[PDB]
Design a protein around this ligand. Structure first.
Ligand SMILES: Cc1cc2nc3c(=O)[nH]c(=O)nc-3n(C[C@H](O)[C@H](O)[C@@H](O)COP(=O)(O)OP(=O)(O)OC[C@H]3O[C@@H](n4cnc5c(N)ncnc54)[C@H](O)[C@@H]3O)c2cc1C
Length: 296
């Protein structure tokens, strides 16, 4: 249950009326040109003014007006940097933004206003920021907890955040000796966000970090089925169910809305064999702070 690291957690220090105005320090495409879409990694200056914590989001207000002549509402984006930031100086915030450009199939092509606003940012530009937002995805207090992270696409953001503190940073007050298991689902290799970082974490802490990739369009299971996050989880169902019934096991899930049912499908088959209903069981896990979901 380790009731998350919520001690002194600040929520909405900046609101839409008077947001923080940060500056884009860097903006780089991190997907290969052949990927089904582009995701960019960006760093904003905060001057230390945004007291965020791992697992939180910040709101961004795009420039311009909507079709009604009214300023754009804020869209939330999960912070991909740890509290210390990519520069390790506590003065920046980083985002992992997927450019939304869709025609669905054919017809009128429309671009998501805020995501496109973000991905086109140039170093030196100002950006209206609000927050921090969120308490659901805060890390567990227990440094020996079993943390299972299930993410898709940009859902990797808060988990990169967790792992920097866990394996790239040194905190006297936080020395993680538990099990961190990351499951990331993407369509192509060119879409494996921060792969190089995660493999570097694997070298450093081989006994504490377990990394499993699921590339749907390049991997299949024995039966010839595409490797979606849940089909990868399925090859560890036995272990995941065992771990799932321990008091210091927390599962975090972040990414696209679709991913949830797929995971529910797998969990149900496992729960049924052991003679318990997954809906009831999941309810209890949520209540015990051990099943935390942030899907959009
Ligand atoms: C807690 C939280 C965390 C988030 N973290 C991230 C993150 O880390 N990275 C990230 O990139 N995004 C993240 N998001 C999503 C983000 O907030 C956005 O919704 C976003 O970037 C799209 O906002 P937008 O302003 O581009 O465009 P809008 O101008 O708001 O476009 C929105 C519309 O796109 C539509 N849409 C998309 N595809 C189609 C389609 N084929 N047909 C019809 N409608 C379609 C829906 O109508 C939707 O309402 C997060 C959201 C939440 C709630």
């Amino acid at each position: 249950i380790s009731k998350k690291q919520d001690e002194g957690v600040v929520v909405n220090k900046f609101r839409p009326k008077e947001p923080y105005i940060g500056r884009c320090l860097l903006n780089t495409k991190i997907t290969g040109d052949d990927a089904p879409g582009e995701t960019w990694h960006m760093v904003f200056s905060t001057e230390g003014e945004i007291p965020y914590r791992e697992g939180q989001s910040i709101g961004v207000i795009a420039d311009g007006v909507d079709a009604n002549g009214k300023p754009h509402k804020l869209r939330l984006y999960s912070i991909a940097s740890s509290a210390l930031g990519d520069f390790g100086d506590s003065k920046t915030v980083s985002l992992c933004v997927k450019r939304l450009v869709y025609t669905n199939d054919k017809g009128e092509e429309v671009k998501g206003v805020c995501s496109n606003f973000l991905c086109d940012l140039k170093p030196g530009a100002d950006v209206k920021i609000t927050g921090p937002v969120g308490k659901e995805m805060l890390m567990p207090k227990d440094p020996n907890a079993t943390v299972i992270m299930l993410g898709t696409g940009t859902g990797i953001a808060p988990f990169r955040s967790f792992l920097w503190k866990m394996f790239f940073e040194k905190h006297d007050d936080y020395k993680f000796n538990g099990l961190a298991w990351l499951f990331l689902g993407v369509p192509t290799s060119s879409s494996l966000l921060y792969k190089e970082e995660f493999e570097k974490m694997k070298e450093k802490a081989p006994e504490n970090f377990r990394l499993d990739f699921a590339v749907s369009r390049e991997q299949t299971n024995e039966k010839g089925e595409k490797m979606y996050i849940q089909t990868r989880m399925a090859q560890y169902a036995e272990e995941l169910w065992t771990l799932l019934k321990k008091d210091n096991t927390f599962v975090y899930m972040c990414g696209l809305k679709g991913m949830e049912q797929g995971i529910d499908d797998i969990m149900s088959s496992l729960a049924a064999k052991e003679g318990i209903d997954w809906a009831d069981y999941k309810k209890q896990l949520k209540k015990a702070e051990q099943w935390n979901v942030e899907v959009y």
